[PDB]
């Protein structure tokens, strides 16, 4: 009944609907999208459901909506470095993170859950993915939507990683547990990691970190090449 994580974002229904309306306004090729149907499918995935019993099947009525064009070679994957990834695509408008697609744009920076017996949106608390349960509305949404975006990637797949982290590449992150395993070797030639020196000055070649060599090994067994670049100065990287 009570959960360890923050509750549903305030005015979540209006936010999801406005975002859909705004996204289909900016992208005229998407004006065929019924935003009422989008909100109804999103709402239907988690309302009246126990927020630790959520499955990929619950999101399929939403997953089918929002078809759009994202060139396979213009995908940008990221892990634990959300701000820099989104600033990059705001500059290089041809490239997309998942949160630049309709489904990702709807849910970016939001939290949501319901209660089993009632039609109420639980605004008090929502399950913490590490403390309460992994099969919660927010975690299941991202894991389900991400897999298809990773399956789409081709040629050189770029991933931005946070080099200031204890684990630059985390095997148990959405990228590490979902996206990496859905990259298709028949279509993907190389996975290129961009290790961001976000925080403190670190003159080290972070492309030699054990977690990077671990990522190289996982991607190698799936018959894909690996490339790594250090982004020593991220603030100057955006201007370049």
């Amino acid at each position, epitope marked *: 009944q009570q959960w360890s994580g923050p509750g549903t974002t305030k005015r979540f229904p209006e936010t999801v609907l406005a975002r859909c309306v705004k996204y289909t306004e900016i992208h*005229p*090729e998407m*004006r*065929h999208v019924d935003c009422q149907s989008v909100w109804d499918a999103f709402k239907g995935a988690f309302i009246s459901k126990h927020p630790c019993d959520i499955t*990929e*099947e619950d999101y*399929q*009525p939403l*997953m*089918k909506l929002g*078809t*759009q*064009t*994202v*060139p*396979c*070679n213009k995908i940008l994957l990221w892990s634990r470095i959300k701000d820099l990834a989104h600033q990059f695509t705001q500059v290089q408008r041809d490239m997309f993170t998942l949160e630049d*697609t309709l489904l990702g744009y709807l849910a970016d920076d939001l939290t949501w859950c319901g209660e089993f017996a009632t039609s109420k949106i639980n605004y008090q608390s929502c399950p913490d993915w590490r403390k309460d349960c992994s099969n919660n509305p927010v975690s299941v949404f991202w894991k389900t939507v991400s*897999r*298809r*975006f990773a*399956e*789409a990637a*081709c*040629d050189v797949v770029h991933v931005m990683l946070d080099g200031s982290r204890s684990k630059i590449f985390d095997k148990d992150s959405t990228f590490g547990s979902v996206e990496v395993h*859905n990259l*298709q070797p*028949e279509k993907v030639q190389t996975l290129e990691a961009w290790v961001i020196h976000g925080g403190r000055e670190d003159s080290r070649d972070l492309c030699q970190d054990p977690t990077i060599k671990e990522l190289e090994s996982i991607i190698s067994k799936r018959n894909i090449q690996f490339s790594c670049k250090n982004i020593y100065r991220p603030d100057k990287f955006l201007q370049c």
Partner: antibody
Amino acid sequence: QVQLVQSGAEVAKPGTSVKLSCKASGYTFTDYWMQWVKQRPGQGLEWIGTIYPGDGDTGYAQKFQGKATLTADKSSKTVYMHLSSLASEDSAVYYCARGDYYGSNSLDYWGQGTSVTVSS
Amino acid sequence: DIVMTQSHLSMSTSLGDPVSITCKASQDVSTVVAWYQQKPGQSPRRLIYSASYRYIGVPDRFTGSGAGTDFTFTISSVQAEDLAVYYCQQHYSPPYTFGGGTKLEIKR
């Protein structure tokens, strides 16, 4: 490697039914619309309808509503198209094709087609 | 249903020359039009989609343009392997209707 493998050629008497199959491999079956296209001998392509296997939602062009029924078997990663009350005009090659979700549902991978011949 | 009209059923060309095929939609389909190539006894193959997008590996001699109700597919330099039937399709709103096809044959 994405592949769509369709069932073999069918021959049917008028008024009977036929169920065609399309087995998908190399991608997450539930996450893409599967669409079907008819091609009468020597004629052009005609869009029949579609199914989203993740939730079973379907839709058909007016011409084929009441003629075609699409279903999906998630365990076998197979989409089926059932054609009822067969007539000579139903003789054609039927293709299944995947809608590219990040290609605005254009048809990226195609099956090899199933020939259906309806005759007495 | 939206009607897609390819006004030329057949076009004669020469190897190395450019060819353009036109398609007209009965209603606005924004930029969401695809072009498929089909050879005898083969399944159709997507060449262009969303009016002008081309999947990695599809030859750059194939281009698409257009928006609204008028679309064009061009082969900048016809190769022997390009003699086939070309179909436009709108993939904007279901039913995702096809044009009637245009067969490209060689002049002699």
